[PDB]
Design a binder for this molecule. Structure first.
Ligand SMILES: *[C@@H]1O[C@H](CO)[C@@H](O[C@@H]2O[C@H](CO)[C@@H](O[C@@H]3O[C@H](CO[C@H]4O[C@H](CO)[C@@H](O)[C@H](O)[C@@H]4O)[C@@H](O)[C@H](O[C@H]4O[C@H](CO)[C@@H](O)[C@H](O)[C@@H]4O)[C@@H]3O)[C@H](O)[C@H]2NC(C)=O)[C@H](O)[C@H]1NC(C)=O
Ligand SMILES: CC(=O)Nc1nnc(S(N)(=O)=O)s1
Ligand SMILES: [Zn+2]
Length: 266
């Protein structure tokens, strides 16, 4: 039903999904000269990331992104509640165009963004249930840029895109070290209250966006940008530009878990 572009595109989401028009939405542009340092923000502590179970993980092209199911044995230990892993997925732009990430830092987008989705199992029994509640979800956002060499960790995912080119196709991915999908310096991140960046746009996410970026090769990017289709069959249409436009900060506070010399905040 909903899409990024067209009649049912993002500019029209509010006409079908009211919350998409609300005022504490995601993604946002994080301007470091406006964040507030919070010395009490804990280390994230991803648990079980190195070994996401022993069974093959499902990889699904759902027409809007490619999504990897994750076992609830993985969870984050440094949050207000116990948030267990449910899935991760990606947002990107398109070959020959700039951008592709959802969040921006100091008004600069990167080529793609990885979202690892967790939900509060202390309070709820499923991802879908938690997705509609206040701080029901905790999503980790990793901005992805292009580096000089192939990133093996991301390759564990990218090497399977050709198996799920059509919307709704699925394939299997052997467990791999998920920690390697994360950038360096896990201790430097931003934290704010936001929402799902796709319809229904529920304001249920406690967001964590890392300060440092992960890097994939130029070739891995082109592969991410032009393999999957948004269609179930012919004619085929490439799944591209699946990132939502920036949403107004609307006076929310963005907190930083770190501070350094020359930080634009004190
Ligand atoms: C995302 O949005 C949520 C919802 O708005 C925010 O949650 C609120 O966070 C504030 C923290 O600033 C909470 O208010 C403070 O509560 C302190 C007591 O905390 C305990 O008790 C509360 C209430 O039962 C619990 O929610 C909490 O978990 C603790 O168990 C008070 O000590 C604070 O008062 C002091 O500071 C104020 C300044 O605002 C002074 O005026 C007071 O005199 C005093 O010095 C304050 O009341 C609030 O309870 C939270 N609401 C909910 C529903 O959780 C998140 O902070 C926000 N996250 C981000 C990253 O933006
Ligand atoms: C059930 C569930 O997780 N739905 C989501 N919708 N958008 C998400 S995102 N892009 O904000 O991570 S997660
Ligand atoms: Zn996402």
């Amino acid at each position: 039903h909903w899409t990024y572009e067209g009649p049912h595109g993002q500019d029209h989401w509010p006409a079908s999904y009211p919350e998409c028009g609300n005022n504490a939405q995601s993604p946002i542009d994080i301007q470091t000269d406006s964040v507030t340092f919070d010395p009490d923000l804990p280390a994230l502590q991803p648990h079980g990331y190195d070994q996401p179970g022993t069974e093959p993980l499902d990889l699904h092209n759902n027409g809007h992104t490619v999504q990897l199911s994750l076992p609830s044995t993985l969870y984050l230990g440094g949050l207000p509640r116990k948030y267990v892993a449910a899935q991760l997925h990606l947002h990107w732009g398109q070959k020959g165009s700039p951008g592709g990430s959802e969040h921006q830092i100091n008004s600069e987008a990167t080529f793609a963004e990885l979202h690892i989705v967790h939900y509060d199992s202390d309070s709820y029994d499923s991802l879908s249930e938690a997705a509609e509640r206040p701080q029901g979800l905790a999503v980790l956002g990793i901005l992805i840029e292009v580096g000089e060499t192939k990133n093996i960790a991301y390759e564990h995912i990218l090497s399977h895109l050709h198996e799920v080119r059509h919307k709704d196709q699925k394939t299997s991915v052997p467990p791999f070290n998920l920690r390697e999908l994360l950038p360096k310096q896990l201790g430097q991140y931003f934290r704010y209250n936001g929402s799902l960046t796709t319809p229904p746009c529920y304001q249920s996410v406690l967001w964590t966006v890392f300060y440092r970026r992960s890097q994939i090769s130029m070739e891995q990017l082109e592969k991410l940008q032009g393999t999957l289709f948004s269609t179930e069959e012919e004619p085929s249409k490439l799944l591209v530009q699946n990132y939502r436009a920036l949403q107004p900060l609307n006076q929310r506070m963005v907190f930083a878990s770190f501070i350094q010399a020359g930080s634009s905040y004190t």
